[PDB]
mmCIF file of all heavy atoms in Angstrom:
data_model
loop_
_atom_site.group_PDB
_atom_site.id
_atom_site.type_symbol
_atom_site.label_atom_id
_atom_site.label_comp_id
_atom_site.label_asym_id
_atom_site.label_seq_id
_atom_site.Cartn_x
_atom_site.Cartn_y
_atom_site.Cartn_z
ATOM 1 N N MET G 1 0.822 -1.203 0.000
ATOM 2 C CA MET G 1 0.000 0.000 0.000
ATOM 3 C C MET G 1 0.868 1.269 0.000
ATOM 4 O O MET G 1 1.798 1.413 0.790
ATOM 5 C CB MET G 1 -0.873 -0.025 1.241
ATOM 6 C CG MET G 1 -1.733 -1.286 1.308
ATOM 7 S SD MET G 1 -3.094 -1.305 -0.121
ATOM 8 C CE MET G 1 -3.176 -3.207 -0.581
ATOM 9 N N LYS G 2 0.556 2.184 -0.899
ATOM 10 C CA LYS G 2 1.264 3.455 -1.021
ATOM 11 C C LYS G 2 1.129 4.337 0.233
ATOM 12 O O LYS G 2 2.043 5.084 0.575
ATOM 13 C CB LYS G 2 0.701 4.213 -2.222
ATOM 14 C CG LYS G 2 1.627 5.218 -2.846
ATOM 15 C CD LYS G 2 0.904 6.027 -3.904
ATOM 16 C CE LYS G 2 1.527 5.871 -5.280
ATOM 17 N NZ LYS G 2 0.608 6.407 -6.350
ATOM 18 N N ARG G 3 0.005 4.244 0.937
ATOM 19 C CA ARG G 3 -0.169 5.116 2.091
ATOM 20 C C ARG G 3 0.602 4.653 3.310
ATOM 21 O O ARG G 3 0.673 5.360 4.317
ATOM 22 C CB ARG G 3 -1.667 5.331 2.372
ATOM 23 C CG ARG G 3 -2.352 4.414 3.362
ATOM 24 C CD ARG G 3 -3.766 4.232 2.840
ATOM 25 N NE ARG G 3 -4.802 4.368 3.843
ATOM 26 C CZ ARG G 3 -6.090 4.549 3.564
ATOM 27 N NH1 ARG G 3 -6.513 4.617 2.303
ATOM 28 N NH2 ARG G 3 -6.954 4.678 4.559
ATOM 29 N N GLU G 4 1.202 3.467 3.185
ATOM 30 C CA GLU G 4 2.040 2.906 4.233
ATOM 31 C C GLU G 4 3.515 3.153 3.908
ATOM 32 O O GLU G 4 4.381 2.856 4.723
ATOM 33 C CB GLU G 4 1.805 1.405 4.371
ATOM 34 C CG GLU G 4 0.449 1.042 4.972
ATOM 35 C CD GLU G 4 0.256 -0.468 5.079
ATOM 36 O OE1 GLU G 4 1.252 -1.211 4.950
ATOM 37 O OE2 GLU G 4 -0.884 -0.921 5.299
ATOM 38 N N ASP G 5 3.806 3.702 2.730
ATOM 39 C CA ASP G 5 5.197 3.951 2.348
ATOM 40 C C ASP G 5 5.719 5.319 2.798
ATOM 41 O O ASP G 5 5.436 6.342 2.183
ATOM 42 C CB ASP G 5 5.375 3.793 0.829
ATOM 43 C CG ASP G 5 6.813 4.021 0.378
ATOM 44 O OD1 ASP G 5 7.571 4.724 1.072
ATOM 45 O OD2 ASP G 5 7.189 3.520 -0.696
ATOM 46 N N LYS G 6 6.496 5.310 3.873
ATOM 47 C CA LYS G 6 7.092 6.508 4.460
ATOM 48 C C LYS G 6 7.873 7.392 3.491
ATOM 49 O O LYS G 6 7.597 8.589 3.385
ATOM 50 C CB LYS G 6 8.022 6.107 5.600
ATOM 51 C CG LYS G 6 8.312 7.188 6.611
ATOM 52 C CD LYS G 6 9.139 6.604 7.740
ATOM 53 C CE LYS G 6 9.399 7.631 8.805
ATOM 54 N NZ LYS G 6 9.682 8.943 8.187
ATOM 55 N N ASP G 7 8.855 6.820 2.791
ATOM 56 C CA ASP G 7 9.666 7.619 1.866
ATOM 57 C C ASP G 7 8.843 8.158 0.725
ATOM 58 O O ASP G 7 9.036 9.294 0.308
ATOM 59 C CB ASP G 7 10.853 6.822 1.301
ATOM 60 C CG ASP G 7 11.984 6.672 2.296
ATOM 61 O OD1 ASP G 7 11.958 7.374 3.335
ATOM 62 O OD2 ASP G 7 12.898 5.858 2.033
ATOM 63 N N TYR G 8 7.926 7.348 0.214
ATOM 64 C CA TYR G 8 7.086 7.808 -0.872
ATOM 65 C C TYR G 8 6.272 9.006 -0.416
ATOM 66 O O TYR G 8 6.064 9.949 -1.185
ATOM 67 C CB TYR G 8 6.132 6.717 -1.343
ATOM 68 C CG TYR G 8 5.443 7.081 -2.628
ATOM 69 C CD1 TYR G 8 5.836 6.496 -3.826
ATOM 70 C CD2 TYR G 8 4.418 8.032 -2.657
ATOM 71 C CE1 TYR G 8 5.231 6.842 -5.025
ATOM 72 C CE2 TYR G 8 3.798 8.390 -3.857
ATOM 73 C CZ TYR G 8 4.215 7.787 -5.037
ATOM 74 O OH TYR G 8 3.628 8.111 -6.238
ATOM 75 N N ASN G 9 5.803 8.975 0.829
ATOM 76 C CA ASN G 9 5.023 10.090 1.319
ATOM 77 C C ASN G 9 5.838 11.334 1.552
ATOM 78 O O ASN G 9 5.543 12.377 0.991
ATOM 79 C CB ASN G 9 4.330 9.765 2.640
ATOM 80 C CG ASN G 9 3.104 8.935 2.460
ATOM 81 O OD1 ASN G 9 3.187 7.708 2.464
ATOM 82 N ND2 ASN G 9 1.949 9.588 2.283
ATOM 83 N N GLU G 10 6.870 11.211 2.384
ATOM 84 C CA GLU G 10 7.675 12.367 2.765
ATOM 85 C C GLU G 10 8.137 13.182 1.583
ATOM 86 O O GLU G 10 8.029 14.416 1.593
ATOM 87 C CB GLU G 10 8.841 11.944 3.654
ATOM 88 C CG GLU G 10 8.421 11.648 5.078
ATOM 89 C CD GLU G 10 9.559 11.097 5.904
ATOM 90 O OE1 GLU G 10 10.605 10.730 5.316
ATOM 91 O OE2 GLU G 10 9.402 11.020 7.139
ATOM 92 N N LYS G 11 8.655 12.505 0.567
ATOM 93 C CA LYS G 11 9.054 13.211 -0.639
ATOM 94 C C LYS G 11 7.813 13.926 -1.231
ATOM 95 O O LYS G 11 7.943 15.002 -1.831
ATOM 96 C CB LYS G 11 9.637 12.216 -1.671
ATOM 97 C CG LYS G 11 9.406 12.578 -3.147
ATOM 98 C CD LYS G 11 8.272 11.751 -3.766
ATOM 99 C CE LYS G 11 7.017 12.574 -3.984
ATOM 100 N NZ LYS G 11 6.104 12.038 -5.039
ATOM 101 N N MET G 12 6.619 13.347 -1.009
ATOM 102 C CA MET G 12 5.340 13.852 -1.559
ATOM 103 C C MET G 12 4.711 14.986 -0.753
ATOM 104 O O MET G 12 4.158 15.928 -1.328
ATOM 105 C CB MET G 12 4.383 12.670 -1.769
ATOM 106 C CG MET G 12 2.921 13.048 -1.963
ATOM 107 S SD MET G 12 2.291 13.270 -3.808
ATOM 108 C CE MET G 12 3.860 14.215 -4.463
ATOM 109 N N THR G 13 4.752 14.864 0.573
ATOM 110 C CA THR G 13 4.347 15.968 1.448
ATOM 111 C C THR G 13 5.311 17.102 0.992
ATOM 112 O O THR G 13 4.876 18.204 0.656
ATOM 113 C CB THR G 13 4.655 15.647 2.922
ATOM 114 O OG1 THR G 13 4.305 14.282 3.192
ATOM 115 C CG2 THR G 13 3.848 16.568 3.841
ATOM 116 N N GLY G 14 6.615 16.797 0.992
ATOM 117 C CA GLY G 14 7.625 17.731 0.531
ATOM 118 C C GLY G 14 7.378 18.438 -0.802
ATOM 119 O O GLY G 14 7.363 19.671 -0.829
ATOM 120 N N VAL G 15 7.160 17.709 -1.898
ATOM 121 C CA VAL G 15 6.996 18.390 -3.176
ATOM 122 C C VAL G 15 5.760 19.265 -3.301
ATOM 123 O O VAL G 15 5.864 20.490 -3.354
ATOM 124 C CB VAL G 15 7.057 17.387 -4.398
ATOM 125 C CG1 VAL G 15 8.285 16.486 -4.270
ATOM 126 C CG2 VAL G 15 5.785 16.567 -4.497
ATOM 127 N N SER G 16 4.597 18.623 -3.288
ATOM 128 C CA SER G 16 3.300 19.265 -3.473
ATOM 129 C C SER G 16 2.647 19.686 -2.181
ATOM 130 O O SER G 16 1.729 20.497 -2.188
ATOM 131 C CB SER G 16 2.355 18.274 -4.157
ATOM 132 O OG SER G 16 1.848 17.343 -3.202
ATOM 133 N N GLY G 17 3.103 19.093 -1.083
ATOM 134 C CA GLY G 17 2.525 19.369 0.222
ATOM 135 C C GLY G 17 1.552 18.299 0.729
ATOM 136 O O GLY G 17 0.956 18.487 1.796
ATOM 137 N N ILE G 18 1.386 17.185 -0.001
ATOM 138 C CA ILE G 18 0.447 16.135 0.425
ATOM 139 C C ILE G 18 0.572 14.774 -0.281
ATOM 140 O O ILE G 18 0.635 14.696 -1.507
ATOM 141 C CB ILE G 18 -1.063 16.645 0.314
ATOM 142 C CG1 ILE G 18 -1.981 15.754 1.154
ATOM 143 C CG2 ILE G 18 -1.550 16.659 -1.126
ATOM 144 C CD1 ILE G 18 -3.467 16.044 0.956
ATOM 145 N N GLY G 19 0.600 13.721 0.539
ATOM 146 C CA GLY G 19 0.708 12.344 0.073
ATOM 147 C C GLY G 19 -0.501 11.449 0.354
ATOM 148 O O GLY G 19 -1.446 11.841 1.056
ATOM 149 N N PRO G 20 -0.417 10.185 -0.134
ATOM 150 C CA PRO G 20 -1.485 9.177 0.017
ATOM 151 C C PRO G 20 -2.055 9.001 1.412
ATOM 152 O O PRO G 20 -3.270 8.880 1.589
ATOM 153 C CB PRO G 20 -0.817 7.881 -0.480
ATOM 154 C CG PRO G 20 0.431 8.334 -1.198
ATOM 155 C CD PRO G 20 0.863 9.580 -0.512
ATOM 156 N N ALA G 21 -1.149 8.981 2.366
ATOM 157 C CA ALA G 21 -1.471 8.853 3.777
ATOM 158 C C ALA G 21 -2.515 9.897 4.147
ATOM 159 O O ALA G 21 -3.399 9.630 4.953
ATOM 160 C CB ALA G 21 -0.211 9.010 4.602
ATOM 161 N N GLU G 22 -2.397 11.079 3.547
ATOM 162 C CA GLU G 22 -3.381 12.131 3.732
ATOM 163 C C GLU G 22 -4.499 12.120 2.658
ATOM 164 O O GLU G 22 -5.681 12.107 3.014
ATOM 165 C CB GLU G 22 -2.716 13.514 3.691
ATOM 166 C CG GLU G 22 -1.349 13.524 4.345
ATOM 167 C CD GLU G 22 -0.831 14.916 4.653
ATOM 168 O OE1 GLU G 22 -0.413 15.629 3.712
ATOM 169 O OE2 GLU G 22 -0.847 15.299 5.847
ATOM 170 N N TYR G 23 -4.153 12.105 1.364
ATOM 171 C CA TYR G 23 -5.220 12.217 0.375
ATOM 172 C C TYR G 23 -6.175 11.058 0.240
ATOM 173 O O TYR G 23 -7.359 11.295 -0.024
ATOM 174 C CB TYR G 23 -4.705 12.674 -1.033
ATOM 175 C CG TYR G 23 -3.796 11.747 -1.817
ATOM 176 C CD1 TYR G 23 -4.240 10.514 -2.295
ATOM 177 C CD2 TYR G 23 -2.494 12.133 -2.127
ATOM 178 C CE1 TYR G 23 -3.393 9.695 -3.049
ATOM 179 C CE2 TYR G 23 -1.665 11.330 -2.864
ATOM 180 C CZ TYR G 23 -2.110 10.122 -3.320
ATOM 181 O OH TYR G 23 -1.228 9.331 -4.012
ATOM 182 N N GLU G 24 -5.718 9.828 0.491
ATOM 183 C CA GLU G 24 -6.617 8.691 0.305
ATOM 184 C C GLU G 24 -7.736 8.677 1.302
ATOM 185 O O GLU G 24 -8.878 8.430 0.941
ATOM 186 C CB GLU G 24 -5.854 7.350 0.293
ATOM 187 C CG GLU G 24 -4.900 7.220 -0.891
ATOM 188 C CD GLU G 24 -4.185 5.894 -0.911
ATOM 189 O OE1 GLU G 24 -4.163 5.228 0.153
ATOM 190 O OE2 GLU G 24 -3.641 5.524 -1.973
ATOM 191 N N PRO G 25 -7.431 8.946 2.582
ATOM 192 C CA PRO G 25 -8.553 8.936 3.522
ATOM 193 C C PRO G 25 -9.455 10.146 3.256
ATOM 194 O O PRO G 25 -10.655 10.084 3.508
ATOM 195 C CB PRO G 25 -7.881 8.980 4.890
ATOM 196 C CG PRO G 25 -6.451 8.544 4.632
ATOM 197 C CD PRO G 25 -6.140 9.074 3.271
ATOM 198 N N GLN G 26 -8.902 11.245 2.747
ATOM 199 C CA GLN G 26 -9.746 12.397 2.426
ATOM 200 C C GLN G 26 -10.724 12.076 1.302
ATOM 201 O O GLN G 26 -11.921 12.374 1.414
ATOM 202 C CB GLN G 26 -8.903 13.620 2.054
ATOM 203 C CG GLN G 26 -8.265 14.229 3.294
ATOM 204 C CD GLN G 26 -7.381 15.420 3.011
ATOM 205 O OE1 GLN G 26 -7.634 16.197 2.089
ATOM 206 N NE2 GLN G 26 -6.342 15.590 3.830
ATOM 207 N N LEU G 27 -10.222 11.445 0.239
ATOM 208 C CA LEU G 27 -11.052 11.092 -0.905
ATOM 209 C C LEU G 27 -12.186 10.172 -0.469
ATOM 210 O O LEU G 27 -13.339 10.319 -0.911
ATOM 211 C CB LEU G 27 -10.182 10.438 -1.984
ATOM 212 C CG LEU G 27 -9.138 11.402 -2.560
ATOM 213 C CD1 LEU G 27 -8.080 10.649 -3.315
ATOM 214 C CD2 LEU G 27 -9.820 12.407 -3.464
ATOM 215 N N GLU G 28 -11.855 9.233 0.408
ATOM 216 C CA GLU G 28 -12.837 8.303 0.929
ATOM 217 C C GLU G 28 -13.976 9.052 1.612
ATOM 218 O O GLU G 28 -15.155 8.776 1.352
ATOM 219 C CB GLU G 28 -12.191 7.353 1.953
ATOM 220 C CG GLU G 28 -11.171 6.369 1.373
ATOM 221 C CD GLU G 28 -10.526 5.507 2.453
ATOM 222 O OE1 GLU G 28 -10.862 5.697 3.638
ATOM 223 O OE2 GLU G 28 -9.684 4.645 2.126
ATOM 224 N N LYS G 29 -13.632 10.009 2.473
ATOM 225 C CA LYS G 29 -14.646 10.751 3.223
ATOM 226 C C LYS G 29 -15.494 11.652 2.346
ATOM 227 O O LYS G 29 -16.716 11.689 2.492
ATOM 228 C CB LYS G 29 -13.998 11.580 4.326
ATOM 229 C CG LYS G 29 -13.262 10.773 5.359
ATOM 230 C CD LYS G 29 -12.549 11.709 6.317
ATOM 231 C CE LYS G 29 -11.330 11.047 6.959
ATOM 232 N NZ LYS G 29 -10.038 11.450 6.299
ATOM 233 N N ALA G 30 -14.838 12.371 1.439
ATOM 234 C CA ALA G 30 -15.525 13.275 0.518
ATOM 235 C C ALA G 30 -16.550 12.512 -0.297
ATOM 236 O O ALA G 30 -17.591 13.054 -0.653
ATOM 237 C CB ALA G 30 -14.533 13.963 -0.411
ATOM 238 N N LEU G 31 -16.250 11.258 -0.604
ATOM 239 C CA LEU G 31 -17.172 10.415 -1.361
ATOM 240 C C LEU G 31 -18.398 10.143 -0.502
ATOM 241 O O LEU G 31 -19.531 10.264 -0.960
ATOM 242 C CB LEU G 31 -16.494 9.090 -1.726
ATOM 243 C CG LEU G 31 -17.345 8.092 -2.526
ATOM 244 C CD1 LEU G 31 -17.860 8.733 -3.818
ATOM 245 C CD2 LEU G 31 -16.526 6.860 -2.831
ATOM 246 N N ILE G 32 -18.166 9.780 0.753
ATOM 247 C CA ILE G 32 -19.263 9.499 1.663
ATOM 248 C C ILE G 32 -20.098 10.751 1.942
ATOM 249 O O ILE G 32 -21.319 10.670 2.029
ATOM 250 C CB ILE G 32 -18.722 8.872 2.961
ATOM 251 C CG1 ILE G 32 -18.072 7.528 2.595
ATOM 252 C CG2 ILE G 32 -19.846 8.704 4.000
ATOM 253 C CD1 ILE G 32 -17.334 6.855 3.718
ATOM 254 N N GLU G 33 -19.440 11.906 2.034
ATOM 255 C CA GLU G 33 -20.114 13.182 2.266
ATOM 256 C C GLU G 33 -20.925 13.621 1.036
ATOM 257 O O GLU G 33 -22.015 14.160 1.167
ATOM 258 C CB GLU G 33 -19.085 14.274 2.602
ATOM 259 C CG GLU G 33 -19.684 15.671 2.839
ATOM 260 C CD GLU G 33 -20.469 15.777 4.142
ATOM 261 O OE1 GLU G 33 -19.851 15.998 5.211
ATOM 262 O OE2 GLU G 33 -21.710 15.634 4.098
ATOM 263 N N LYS G 34 -20.405 13.382 -0.160
ATOM 264 C CA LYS G 34 -21.097 13.801 -1.379
ATOM 265 C C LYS G 34 -22.081 12.792 -1.926
ATOM 266 O O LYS G 34 -22.996 13.145 -2.667
ATOM 267 C CB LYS G 34 -20.083 14.103 -2.487
ATOM 268 C CG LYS G 34 -19.284 15.375 -2.291
ATOM 269 C CD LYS G 34 -19.706 16.441 -3.285
ATOM 270 C CE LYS G 34 -19.105 17.788 -2.924
ATOM 271 N NZ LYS G 34 -19.428 18.833 -3.930
#
């Protein structure tokens, strides 16, 4: 799972400001909310 990958995330929080660990659970909730 990508959201469990520390290095993949950190470089990602770093570049754009946000990784899977953050965006995947957000997408899940937004779907339930919408």
Side-chain angles (χ1 to χ4, degrees):
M1 303 293 144
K2 204 187 241 166
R3 93 214 226 164
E4 289 180 14
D5 181 335
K6 201 175 183 320
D7 284 348
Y8 191 104
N9 282 89
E10 283 174 348
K11 148 258 107 157
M12 164 93 319
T13 318
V15 311
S16 79
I18 198 188
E22 323 195 286
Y23 66 65
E24 295 181 342
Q26 286 178 33
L27 295 164
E28 292 177 359
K29 298 174 206 100
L31 180 56
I32 297 173
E33 179 71 83
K34 288 251 169 176

